[PDB]
RNA sequence: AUAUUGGCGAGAGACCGAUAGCGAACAAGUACAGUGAUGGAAAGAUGAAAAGAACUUUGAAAAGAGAGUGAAAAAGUACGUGAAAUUGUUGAAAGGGAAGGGCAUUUGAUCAGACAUGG
RNA sequence: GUCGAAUUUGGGUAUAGGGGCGAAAGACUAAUCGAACCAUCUAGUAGCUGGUUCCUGCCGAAGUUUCCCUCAGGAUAGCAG
RNA sequence: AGAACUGGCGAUGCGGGAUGAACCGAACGUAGAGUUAAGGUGCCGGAAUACACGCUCAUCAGACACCACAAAAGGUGUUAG
RNA sequence: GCCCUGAAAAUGGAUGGCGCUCAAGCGUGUUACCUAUACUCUACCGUCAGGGUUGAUAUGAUGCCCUGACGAGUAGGCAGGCGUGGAGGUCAGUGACGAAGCCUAGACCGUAAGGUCGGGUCGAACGGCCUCUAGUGCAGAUCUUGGUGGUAGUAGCAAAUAUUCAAAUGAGAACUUUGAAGACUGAAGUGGGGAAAGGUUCCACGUCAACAGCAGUUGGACGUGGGUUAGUCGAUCCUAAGA
RNA sequence: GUGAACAGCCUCUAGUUGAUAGAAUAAUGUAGAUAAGGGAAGUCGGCAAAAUAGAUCCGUAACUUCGGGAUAAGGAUUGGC
RNA sequence: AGAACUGGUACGGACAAGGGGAAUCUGACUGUCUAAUUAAAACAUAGCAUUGCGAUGGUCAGAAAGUGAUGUUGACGCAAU
RNA sequence: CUAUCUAGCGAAACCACAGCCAAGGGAACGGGCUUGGCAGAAUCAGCGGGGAAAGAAGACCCUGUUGAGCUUGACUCUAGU
RNA sequence: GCGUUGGAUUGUUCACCCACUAAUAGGGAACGUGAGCUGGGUUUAGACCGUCGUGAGACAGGUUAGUUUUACCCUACUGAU
RNA sequence: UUGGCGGAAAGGCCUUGGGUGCUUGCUGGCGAAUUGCAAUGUCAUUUUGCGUGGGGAUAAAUCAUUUGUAUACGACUUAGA
């Protein structure tokens, strides 16, 4: 309860939250903004082929010096990637939406993922030794993730 | 400041940039001035380099130590099945550059050529020329009156010709299509000579000849990222030298403070185009021969192609044009052959060649036998056979 | 009669208000450091009341989604308020080797000051 | 390099800071040595470097004189309020 | 490097000198209309590709104070004397 | 006089640039034209100066009013004000019907320091005026404490020969267990015990939030338990350098 | 076992197979090798690298503190049966 | 130790394992040190020489002492260079 | 074996604002100013020209009425004798 | 426009010889060029001599030994989407 | 609608034969106001979405897989109904 902000209309969809889950924040943010929009079969089968790397996760922001892949010609894009982690705990959270969509009387054909947004969790924090009897730190970024599904509107 | 030597900078500042080619064709920048007092011909030939060789012949050059003495020579024998015709483009002057006006296509193109369209074929509905040939059906008109534009205007006739790629070795099925121009007289003469040529086949014999010099246009053996030491010639630092010594050491100066266009650093080798020139023809091979690798002495009834095949090339079944020393490229690639820019009266140029004996050994080891003829003739019986 | 940054019992302040006030408002001379002498922190606030979320559902679980408690969950033992840097999403805009500023107006957005006369 | 002794080494024991110990390098004396470490005197002193927190109004300088173990500083006069 | 009188810069923006502490002009409350200064008016650029008499042709012309240099020496170029 | 020679330096470049040859060059003359925070007139702000005015005559005599002039500013002096914690006095001041605080390219007032308001958020307090008082105003001090960025999903996670098939278990298996294969340490050991030191790490069962810089169902981790048996092994006795 | 051997190399008992992993094999590296002809011309300098090497049997200079110098140097040989 | 036979003339076949020679400067040698930029020609050393001292003493220690090192010593000794 | 590309994991230096040049002037070597050349998203591997790159409030030198280690017929003293 | 070299001695720049050659021109680019090398010289700390100094120490006098750090950022340059 | 001409970026030009709206070459019959004395009063052409009806056509590219004439990654080059 209480999320980003959403236009969406909440008796034609349900949501799903995850919060401080060690994946990578920068990464997750970049599967994130893959599906973000996309009708919940299309992304959900995607994310899935993503995984047996067939297609990629385009790397727009949280991506320099990221390699380049001819999988990411698709979005018109040449560093892509394929975070698994990533595709994983979002893959759970789409579940947990189609889920409480269906508990809903949703029509699960009508589902698409109306709204998708993480950002960044309290950081975990562990200890490098670096050379010259030094300390340094070594954090974990962990991200909250939400998301929500909607039936498409007859128009 | 004032180095403390002198030495000649390392390498060519005018073969900038050493960037890979953008096609593995390379282009054939000019043809031959025209002299439109001889017959229609064609300018340049494509085909494909099959492997070299060696050959043994008497030089004649009048007072050297060599006149009247054999010497050997090593030879490019490059694979020229005769191209066909399937075009004819037309080029007119403007204050801009030569500018296409129009390109006018045969009716019936073969599956080769236009198999060079489709980046997927075998999923394609092949439709490449299908509503262009209809242009004909009517009668004419269509393609009547636009060799008829070509004949008014345009300054030069450029012919489009392919290689029947299917006739080499290669695997590779889609075909290589270039212009090459038209060097006979008179504009309409020429798109007449094109026009009648359609489908039909030209060889090289009908471009080139013994003893004759051309050029060879062909793209460099790629090699990738190279260091500065191999790609640029560039002295091998020290060994005592930390951070590794295939490098330059001094990068520049400190003023101008920018690294300048004019040193060595490390990118591309290979994959480049290059224009060879003065390559003479000491062999114009006709595949309908059996004895394409004999000599008026020695007359044994062999072919040019090496016992065992050309190495990562195969055997030579077509025409063949075998030119004295190497030309870029490597094996299987496509070669643009293109007659002098120029006439040579060298006497180097103008020594007319009658090979005495062309090797014909395996080149995919040290060969002893030209014939396997020879090789039984030889060897005695193995305990196979009889 | 005089002294009194110690000890015991008290009454007070135009003192400080959790980076302040004693180092310590808390299991503070604690945790931790050092062979040792010594050095020495951080750390207060759900709600009137745990009424600390029965139950159902998704999940391997953590949890999510409903439900329920409550004046409030925009108070969920991460808990009063919850600023800034920095961040995700959405919305608008601009962007030929920085950005930002001054005077001026176009354009878009936005906000005004009215005051009262006869049916 | 040396490798059967002026050998290597465990534990115990002794020497403690203007002191030790030194086949001598100012070496070593708990990552500290041309004087260890700890706390206190101690908010040591600085003619030298750095910073010094709101607005507007009005007036508005000096780098020159004299003396100074004076020359990166003061006193003195001038300029200023 | 060091003195002399005055004016500046420093402490001061503004218009000019492309540029710039110190030159030229001119010193400053918020503004309107006018006129100017020094400097400019082919175009960049507001403002006569104005008027008038000469001079100059450079296979290294020249083009504005401070100021971003030039000399002894020489020319049957050309102009006037 | 103008022009030519005399006239040689290092990235590519400078009458400011373009470019200009009866000039857009040089010398001279004559007009017009452009333009400063300067000059002229006027409004308004302030400063200073000079006056007028409470005789009884609704609400400011330190006030009202008339007139003239002037306005650069570092270091610096002075004046008048803005704002904060606390104190005396007064508005019988605001407030759970919402104090304070915070958010707000919403509004108003002031040259400014600032002041006032609306909307959202909040939840127990808090203002104005006269006065008192000071631990009273930050952008800087390689300032103090804390918190956060870009760097960046980047440097990197490459010493020490080497792993592979299959089953089991599990939500999950490159990494756990059993089986097989391939290998290593090669007794100067990667074997079998001990001294100093640690202090339960030992063993069993359960078990993965954290930790084991991938992983984890495994562990020297977490939870809960269990375990160390002496006349003869040591200490204990003796003396050593010393104390 | 080899061997002069507690060297190196391979093995038995015992113990491990633990040091993120997958795909590639560009430049430049770090570590390990080789190079035709010349042979220190490289460089402050043979730095680095290369060459020699066990054993048996011959042979062995100046000098000398008579002990040495000396594996001086320089040669031949080496399996299996 | 010797002999025959045998081989793509190989045979300490992996492993293991000195390069040599002629000289100048310098320290005799073995040994020592700047832990963490100097291993050396520097320190040490045997050897040589000097100095002081017969105990109511030489050299040295302690604030002082019925205090202490040499000394369980005595010039073939102790101390100092 | 790296680098490289992938999954997981994931720091640090440094950071006025930043990042194309030529000339000019300028605190006498500009990323920014003036006049010109010019100038088109987002990027990967390399590189050592520049960022007068980063690392320490310059060890050099001077100044300071600032030291300390050491030496001496410096000044002034002192254990001892 | 195009070239301007191979060597002996020296850390050297310079110098000076041998030798080849068409010629072995002179200069700049932070006395170009150390996150490019090297570290021979110079100039820390060890050490010998000589001169100087009573001494501690000094000496563009001779001599020997003496740790050469970081790029993953921007730009530039090379290549690559 | 009949002929022609134009390729420098022709994308336009000349010409034939009618049809048809207008014709201010000329002579008539109406109409305009109150839009209140200017503001404010012809609408030009780009794109881009939908809408009607008419003609018309019925493909590839990328991922993946595969080649090695290519290659750090992308990219390149082949192959597959
Ligand atoms: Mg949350
Ligand atoms: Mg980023
Ligand atoms: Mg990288
Ligand atoms: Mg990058
Ligand atoms: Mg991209
Ligand atoms: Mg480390
Ligand atoms: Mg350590
Ligand atoms: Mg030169
Ligand atoms: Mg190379
Ligand atoms: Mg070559
Ligand atoms: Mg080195
Ligand atoms: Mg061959
Ligand atoms: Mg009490
Ligand atoms: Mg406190
Ligand atoms: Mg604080
Ligand atoms: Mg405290
Ligand atoms: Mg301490
Ligand atoms: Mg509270
Ligand atoms: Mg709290
Ligand atoms: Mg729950
Ligand atoms: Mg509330
Ligand atoms: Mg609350
Ligand atoms: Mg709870
Ligand atoms: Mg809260
Ligand atoms: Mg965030
Ligand atoms: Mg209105
Ligand atoms: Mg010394
Ligand atoms: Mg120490
Ligand atoms: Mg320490
Ligand atoms: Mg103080
Ligand atoms: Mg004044
Ligand atoms: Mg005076
Ligand atoms: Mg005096
Ligand atoms: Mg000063
Ligand atoms: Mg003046
Ligand atoms: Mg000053
Ligand atoms: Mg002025
Ligand atoms: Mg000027
Ligand atoms: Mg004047
Ligand atoms: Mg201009
Ligand atoms: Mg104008
Ligand atoms: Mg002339
Ligand atoms: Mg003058
Ligand atoms: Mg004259
Ligand atoms: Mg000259
Ligand atoms: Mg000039
Ligand atoms: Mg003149
Ligand atoms: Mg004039
Ligand atoms: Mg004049
Ligand atoms: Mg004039
Ligand atoms: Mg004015
Ligand atoms: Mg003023
Ligand atoms: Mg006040
Ligand atoms: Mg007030
Ligand atoms: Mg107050
Ligand atoms: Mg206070
Ligand atoms: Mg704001
Ligand atoms: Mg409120
Ligand atoms: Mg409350
Ligand atoms: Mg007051
Ligand atoms: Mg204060
Ligand atoms: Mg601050
Ligand atoms: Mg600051
Ligand atoms: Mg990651
Ligand atoms: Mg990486
Ligand atoms: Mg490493
Ligand atoms: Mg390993
Ligand atoms: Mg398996
Ligand atoms: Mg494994
Ligand atoms: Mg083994
Ligand atoms: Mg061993
Ligand atoms: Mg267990
Ligand atoms: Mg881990
Ligand atoms: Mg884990
Ligand atoms: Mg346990
Ligand atoms: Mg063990
Ligand atoms: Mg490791
Ligand atoms: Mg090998
Ligand atoms: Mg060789
Ligand atoms: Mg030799
Ligand atoms: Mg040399
Ligand atoms: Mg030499
Ligand atoms: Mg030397
Ligand atoms: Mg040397
Ligand atoms: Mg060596
Ligand atoms: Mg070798
Ligand atoms: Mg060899
Ligand atoms: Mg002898
Ligand atoms: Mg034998
Ligand atoms: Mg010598
Ligand atoms: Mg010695
Ligand atoms: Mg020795
Ligand atoms: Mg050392
Ligand atoms: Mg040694
Ligand atoms: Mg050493
Ligand atoms: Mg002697
Ligand atoms: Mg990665
Ligand atoms: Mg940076
Ligand atoms: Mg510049
Ligand atoms: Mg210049
Ligand atoms: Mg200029
Ligand atoms: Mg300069
Ligand atoms: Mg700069
Ligand atoms: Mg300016
Ligand atoms: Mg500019
Ligand atoms: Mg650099
Ligand atoms: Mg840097
Ligand atoms: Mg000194
Ligand atoms: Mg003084
Ligand atoms: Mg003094
Ligand atoms: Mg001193
Ligand atoms: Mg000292
Ligand atoms: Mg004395
Ligand atoms: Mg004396
Ligand atoms: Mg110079
Ligand atoms: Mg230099
Ligand atoms: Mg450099
Ligand atoms: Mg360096
Ligand atoms: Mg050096
Ligand atoms: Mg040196
Ligand atoms: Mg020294
Ligand atoms: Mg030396
Ligand atoms: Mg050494
Ligand atoms: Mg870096
Ligand atoms: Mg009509
Ligand atoms: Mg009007
Ligand atoms: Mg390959």
């Known amino acids: 309860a209480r999320y980003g902000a959403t236009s969406t209309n909440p008796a034609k969809s349900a949501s799903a939250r995850g919060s401080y889950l060690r994946v990578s924040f920068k990464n997750t943010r970049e599967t994130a903004q893959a599906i973000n929009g996309w009708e919940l079969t299309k992304a959900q089968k995607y994310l899935e082929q993503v995984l047996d790397h067939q297609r990629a996760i385009p790397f727009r922001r949280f991506n320099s010096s990221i390699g380049r892949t001819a999988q990411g010609k698709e979005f018109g894009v040449t560093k892509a990637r394929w975070p698994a982690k990533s595709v994983k705990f979002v893959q759970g959270l789409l579940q947990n939406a189609a889920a409480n969509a269906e508990a809903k009387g949703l029509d699960a054909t009508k589902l698409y993922v109306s709204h998708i947004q993480v950002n960044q969790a309290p950081k975990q924090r562990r200890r490098t030794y670096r050379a010259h009897g030094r300390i340094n730190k070594y954090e974990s970024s962990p991200s909250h993730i939400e998301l929500v599904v909607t039936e498409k509107e007859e128009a | ?386």
Request: charged share 30%; hydrophobic share 35%; aromatic share 8%.
């Open chain 2, 1 to 386: 400041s004032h180095r403390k030597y002198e030495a000649p900078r390392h390498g060519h500042l005018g073969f900038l940039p050493r960037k890979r080619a953008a096609s593995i064709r390379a282009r054939v920048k000019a043809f031959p001035k025209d002299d439109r007092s001889k017959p229609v011909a064609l300018t340049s030939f494509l085909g494909y380099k099959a492997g070299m060789t060696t050959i043994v012949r008497d030089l004649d050059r009048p007072g050297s130590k060599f006149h009247k003495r054999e010497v050997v020579e090593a030879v490019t024998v490059v694979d020229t099945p005769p191209v066909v015709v399937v075009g004819v483009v037309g080029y007119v002057e403007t204050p801009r550059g030569l500018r296409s006006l129009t390109t006018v296509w045969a009716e019936h193109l073969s599956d080769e050529v236009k198999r060079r369209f489709y980046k997927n074929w075998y999923k394609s509905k092949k439709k490449a020329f299908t509503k262009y040939s209809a242009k004909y059906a009517q009668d004419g008109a269509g393609i009547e009156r636009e060799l008829a534009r070509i004949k008014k205007y345009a300054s030069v006739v450029r012919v489009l010709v392919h290689t029947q790629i299917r006739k080499t070795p290669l695997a590779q099925k889609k075909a290589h299509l270039a212009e090459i121009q038209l060097n006979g007289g008179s504009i309409s003469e020429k798109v007449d000579w094109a026009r009648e040529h359609f489908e039909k086949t030209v060889a090289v014999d009908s471009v080139f000849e013994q003893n004759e010099m051309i050029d060879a246009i062909a793209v460099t053996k790629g090699h990738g990222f190279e260091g500065v030491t191999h790609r640029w010639g560039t002295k091998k630092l020290p060994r005592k030298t930390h951070r590794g010594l295939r490098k330059v050491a001094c990068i520049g100066a400190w003023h101008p403070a920018h690294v300048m266009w004019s040193v060595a650093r490390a990118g591309q080798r290979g994959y480049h185009s290059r224009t060879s020139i003065n390559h003479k023809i000491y062999r114009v091979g006709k595949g309908d021969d059996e004895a394409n690798g004999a000599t008026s002495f020695d007359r044994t009834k062999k072919t040019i192609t090496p016992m065992g095949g050309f190495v990562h090339y195969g055997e030579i079944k077509n025409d063949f044009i075998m030119v004295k020393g190497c030309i870029p490229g490597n094996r299987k690639r496509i070669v643009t052959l293109r007659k002098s820019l120029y006439t040579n009266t060298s006497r180097k140029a103008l020594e007319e060649v009658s090979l005495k004996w062309i090797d014909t050994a395996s080149k995919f080891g040290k060969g002893r036998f030209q014939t396997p003829a020879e090789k039984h003739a030889f060897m005695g019986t193995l305990k196979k056979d009889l």
